[PDB]
Each structure stands twice: as structure tokens, then as C-alpha cells.
Amino acid sequence: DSRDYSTELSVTVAVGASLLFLNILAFAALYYK
Amino acid sequence: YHEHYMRNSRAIGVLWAIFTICFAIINVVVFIQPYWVGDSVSTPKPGYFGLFHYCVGSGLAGRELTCRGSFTDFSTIPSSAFKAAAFFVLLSMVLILGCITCFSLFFFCNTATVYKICAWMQLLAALCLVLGCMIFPDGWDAETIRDMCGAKTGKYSLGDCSVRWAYILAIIGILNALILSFLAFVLGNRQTD
Amino acid sequence: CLDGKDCASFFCCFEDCHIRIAKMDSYARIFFPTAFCLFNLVYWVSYLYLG
Numbered sequence: 059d060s061r062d063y064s065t066e067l068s069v070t071v072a073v074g075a076s077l078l079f080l081n082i083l084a085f086a087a088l089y090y091k
Numbered sequence: 092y093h094e095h096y097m098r099n100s101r102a103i104g105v106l107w108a109i110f111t112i113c114f115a116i117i118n119v120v121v122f123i124q125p126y127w128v129g130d131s132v133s134t135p136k137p138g139y140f141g142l143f144h145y146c147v148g149s150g151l152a153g154r155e156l157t158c159r160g161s162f163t164d165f166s167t168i169p170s171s172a173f174k175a176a177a178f179f180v181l182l183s184m185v186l187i188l189g190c191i192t193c194f195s196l197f198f199f200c201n202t203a204t205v206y207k208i209c210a211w212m213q214l215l216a217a218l219c220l221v222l223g224c225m226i227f228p229d230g231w232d233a234e235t236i237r238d239m240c241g242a243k244t245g246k247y248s249l250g251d252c253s254v255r256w257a258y259i260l261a262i263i264g265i266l267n268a269l270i271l272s273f274l275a276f277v278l279g280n281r282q283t284d
Numbered sequence: 285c286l287d288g289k290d291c292a293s294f295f296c297c298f299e300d301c302h303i304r305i306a307k308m309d310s311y312a313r314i315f316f317p318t319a320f321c322l323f324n325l326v327y328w329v330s331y332l333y334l335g
């Protein structure tokens with residue numbers, strides 16, 4: 059096995075950034091009077 | 092204006108619940124899956140380990156990954172720091188599941204009070220997940236971990252091994268929990284208006 | 285507390301705070317089945333699929 063973890067970390071960071079961005083959109087919806 | 096106000100509050104509450112369930116799934120996955128740290132090209136032996144479970148290769152140019160560890164039996168956990176981290180990551184999971192249970196209180200109890208109850212249960216969950224992430228690196232001196240990663244490994248030092256998806260997913264879970272906690276606080280104060 | 289409330293007024297419930305004890309049976313009617321259902325979901329998924 060090629061003991062390299064770059065694609066795995068990349069997809070994990072992508073999913074995490076997506077979820078965090080959705081939560082900042084939730085703040086955007088709230089704080090926008 | 093008020094009907095738009097109520098519609099936005101309701102929708103954002105629904106999305107907050109959805110993201111709470113997503114974070115609960117993340118917490119369960121990181122607690123269970125043993126992919127917090129893993130071998131590298133320069134490592135002596137192959138394998139990986141999580142909070143309590145660890146799998147190591149015998150060292151014969153094959154997989155043959157002998158696997159040992161279980162949270163039910165605290166004897167098999169390599170070190171005390173691992174035990175403490177596994178406890179905190181569980182207390183965090185039991186506290187996020189408690190909020191998902193407390194969603195049922197929205198029928199009867201005042202909505203602001205329930206929002207704040209989950210705000211405080213999510214804040215504590217993030218604090219536990221943060222204490223669990225700070226304490227887990229302290230057990231990297233354990234001889235079992237040192238045997239796989241190598242001599243260079245130590246307390247608060249990766250050495251030759253590299254972090255795998257579970258660790259960064261737990262960090263993302265910390266951030267998500269904190270953001271959801273503030274979201275719940277703002278929603279709870281927003282229903283009162 | 286950017287809303288303009290006190291730290292206590294923003295991050296704590298003190299409007300009347302318990303007083304709602306007669307409705308304890310009402311909460312437990314749906315709380316306890318919900319807790320048991322969640323416990324079974326994590327319990328069975330953990331042992332059969334994840335590990």
C-alpha cells in the first residue's frame with residue numbers, strides 16, 4: 059500500500075469546509091436584519 | 092415583516108437541527124473509527140490507531156494487521172492520556188445525543204429555553220471534544236505507539252507518523268460544535284425578540 | 285452578548301426559573317423513548333457496521 063494520505067485529507071478538509079461554510083451562512087441569515 | 096421574521100427563524104432552526112445531527116454523526120464516526128494517526132513512508136512498521144483501538148503490522152511486506160484495543164476494556168488502551176481522551180470524546184457524544192433528545196422538548200417547553208438548553212449542551216460538547224483533542228497527543232510516548240511510529244515520536248510530537256482523516260475531522264467537529272452553540276444561543280435570544 | 289443583553293440575560297434562562305414540575309410526566313413520555321431510540325441507533329450501528 060502506498061502509505062500516502064493526501065487525497066483522504068483533502069476530501070475530509072473539503073467536507074469540513076462545506077459544513078462550516080453552511081453554518082456561516084446560517085449566521086449570515088440571522089445577523090442580516 | 093413579522094411573518095418573514097418567523098419564517099426565517101423557523102427555517103434557520105430547522106437547518107440548525109440538521110447540522111446538529113450532522114455533527115452528532117461526525118462525533119460518533121471519530122469516536123469509533125480508528126484513523127486518528129497513521130504510518131508514513133519512513134515509518135518502521137505500518138498501522139494506525141485511534142482513541143483506544145490500534146492496528147499494527149507484523150513487518151513482513153504484507154498487511155497482517157494485528158488489531159487490539161477496546162473502550163469496554165480499559166486494560167488494552169495503551170496509555171492514560173488515551174483513556175482520558177476517549178472519555179472526553181464520549182462525554183461529548185453523550186452530550187450531543189442529549190441535545191438531539193432534547194429536541195423533543197420543543198413541543199411543550201418554551202422554544203427559547205430549549206434553544207438555550209442545547210446551546211449549553213453543544214458548548215460543553217465542544218469543550219469536551221477540545222480537551223479530548225489536546226489530551227490525546229500526550230499518549231504518543233506510549234511504547235506501543237513508539238514501536239510503530241519510531242524512536243523520534245514523543246509527547247506532542249508526531250515524529251514519523253502523520254495525522255489521518257479522523258483527527259482533522261475531530262478538529263472540524265470542534266469548530267462545528269462551537270459554531271452551532273453560538274447559533275443556538277442567537278436563535279434562543281431571537282425567538283424572544 | 286452583541287444583542288445588547290447581559291451575559292446572564294444572553295447565555296442563561298432566568299425569565300421565571302423548578303416551576304414546571306407538573307409537566308414532568310409530559311416530557312418523559314417522549315423524552316425517554318427518544319433517548320432509548322438514539323441509544324439503540326448508535327449502539328447497533330457501532331457494533332455491526334463501523335467496528
Ligand SMILES: CCCCCCCC/C=C\CCCCCCCC(=O)O[C@H](COC(=O)CCCCCCCCCCCCCCC)COP(=O)(O)OC[C@@H](O)CO
Nearest residue numbers: 101104105108112191192194195197198199200201202318
Ligand atoms: C440519522 C439520525 C436521525 C436523528 C433524528 C433525531 C430525532 C429526535 C427526536 C425527535 C425530535 C422531534 C422534535 C419536533 C419538535 C417540533 C416543534 C415545533 O413544532 O417547532 C416549533 C418551533 O421550533 C423550532 O423551530 C425548532 C425546530 C427543531 C426541530 C427538531 C427536529 C428536527 C428533526 C430533523 C431530522 C432530520 C434527520 C437528518 C439526518 C441526516 C415549536 O413548537 P410550537 O410552535 O408548537 O411551540 C409553541 C410553544 O408555545 C409551546 O411549545
Ligand SMILES: CC(C)CCC[C@@H](C)[C@H]1CC[C@H]2[C@@H]3CC=C4C[C@@H](O)CC[C@]4(C)[C@H]3CC[C@]12C
Nearest residue numbers: 161162163185188189192319322323326327330
Ligand atoms: C441517553 C442518550 C441521549 C445518549 C446515549 C449514549 C449512548 C449512545 C452511548 C453511551 C456509551 C456508548 C458506548 C461506549 C463504548 C463503546 C465501545 C466501542 O468499541 C463501540 C461504541 C460503544 C459501544 C459506545 C456506543 C454508544 C454508547 C452506548
Ligand SMILES: CCCCCCCCCC
Nearest residue numbers: 115116119322325326329
Ligand atoms: C454513517 C454512520 C452513522 C453513524 C451513526 C450516526 C448516529 C447519529 C446520532 C444518532
Ligand SMILES: [Cl-]
Nearest residue numbers: 160161162163
Ligand atoms: Cl470498545
